[PDB]
Paper text:
The protein that gives the process its name, Clathrin, is a triskelion composed of three heavy chains (Clathrin Heavy Chain, Chc) that provide the structural backbone of the lattice, further stabilized and regulated by three light chains (Clathrin Light Chain, Clc). The proximal domain specifically interacts with Clcs, whereas, the N-terminal domain (NTD) of Chc, which adopts a WD40 beta-propeller structure, is pivotal for interactions with various adaptor proteins (APs). To investigate the existence of binding sites present in Clathrin NTD, we crystallized the N-terminal domain of Chc with different peptides derived from adaptor proteins containing CBMs. All our structures show that each peptide binds to three different binding pockets (Clathrin, Arrestin and W-box).
Crystal structure of Chc-NTD (displayed as a grey cartoon) bound to CBMs from Ent1 (1.75 Å, red), Ent2 (1.74 Å, yellow), Ent5 (Ent5.1 LIDL motif, 2.01 Å, green), Apl2.1 (Apl2.1 LLDLF motif, 2.75 Å, blue) and Yap1801 (1.95 Å, grey). Additionally, K98 interacts with position −2 of the motif as observed in the Ent5.1, Apl2.1 and Yap1801 complexes. Residue K284 within the W-box establishes salt bridges with the carboxy-terminal of Ent1, Ent2 and Yap1801. Concurrently, K326 forms hydrogen bonds with the peptide backbone at positions +2, +4 and +1 for the Ent5.1, Apl2.1 and Yap1801 complexes. Water-mediated interactions are also observed in the W-box between the NTD backbone (L24, D25 and V309) and the peptide at position +3, for both Ent1 and Ent2. However, Apl2.1 and Yap1801 do not show density compatible with water molecules near the binding sites. Interestingly, the substitution of the second Leu (LIDL) and/or the addition of non-negatively charged residues at the C-terminal of the CBM decreases the binding affinity. Specifically, the Leu/Ile substitution on Yap1802 retrieves a KDApp≅ 311 µM and the Leu/Met substitution on Yap1801 a KDApp≅ 598 µM.
Author numbering:
A (entry chain A): -1 to 369
B (entry chain E), C (entry chain G): 1 to 7
The structure:
Amino acid sequence: MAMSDLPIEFTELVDLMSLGISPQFLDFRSTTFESDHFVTVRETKDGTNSVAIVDLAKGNEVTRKNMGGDSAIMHPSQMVISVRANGTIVQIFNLETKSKLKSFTLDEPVIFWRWLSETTLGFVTARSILTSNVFDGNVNAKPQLLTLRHANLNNTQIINFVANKNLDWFAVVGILQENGRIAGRIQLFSKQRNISQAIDGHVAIFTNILLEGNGSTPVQVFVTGNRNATTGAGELRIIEIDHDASLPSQYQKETTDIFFPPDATNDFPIAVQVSEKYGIIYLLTKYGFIHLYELETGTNLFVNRITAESVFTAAPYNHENGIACINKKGQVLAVEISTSQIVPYILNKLSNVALALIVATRGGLPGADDL
Amino acid sequence: NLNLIDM
Amino acid sequence: NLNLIDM
């Protein structure tokens, strides 16, 4: 396929090794990525920790600071850094105003954290799942218990924690070795119902879709991807949550195969992000394959290899219209749909008029005026 | 309790 | 106070 006909736009946002980052820190624990605004690299040199903040939105400007903690993340959009020492001491600072937003010491160590929203930080301990309203102004208030972890996440490495926009549905993802492969486990929690459900999956996200009949009111869907560690079968599922009975149109569950080539036995999904505006799911594998699916139908649009070096983390890109990731060589890579080519691609390469109409209509995209 | 989702 | 980051 000629490059001008690709339905995606690919960009290298930065090469971290060009900024002087050492490859020994390019790993899931040390180089963190909450959004395409920033990359935070925790460095240790002669026994002393530091953080390098790379501002991808400002020409890859690097801000370096010494720190006493051993784990650090940036906010999705603001110059707010969250630092912890050995899971127990936690401090969150606005680097602009210099002000301390949160400062507390946990009795039970935090072992994973992730921004759930612009206002809310999620914490997972050995036993518990918590959230903090970081910007509530009460500096010493500890995170609030959301729920206990489900036993299905026992013995997993926690790799993600996501929520819906209403902050009343949540998913925690962990991985473990099983049958010589990596299996994924997900705890889904409804805050309104105070109920958890254990499911199999490597990736998860909550999103919204506008359906015919429903005016401008979206319906909510949960998107999950899985590779079965016994059978090797890959599956994407999209399922409605909390249907508003006032709305005439419901989202019928969709299931789609996730393709794995024959020599990719040990590959699995590592990230999923969604463009709400365009209704496009972007699913990335550990080995660097990107898979696009249309959100309404679950149709697999496109599969391509964006990197040969393994991906270790990912985040939304371009106001959550795409996906960005970091590979083991320190390249920060981004994919979003080509607004000029996606509809022609569906029409001409997939020969799918109905799907072309769906995508064109939802996104206000060119290429479908003659249908 | 029912499943939250059909999965 | 302890500050974990050197501002």
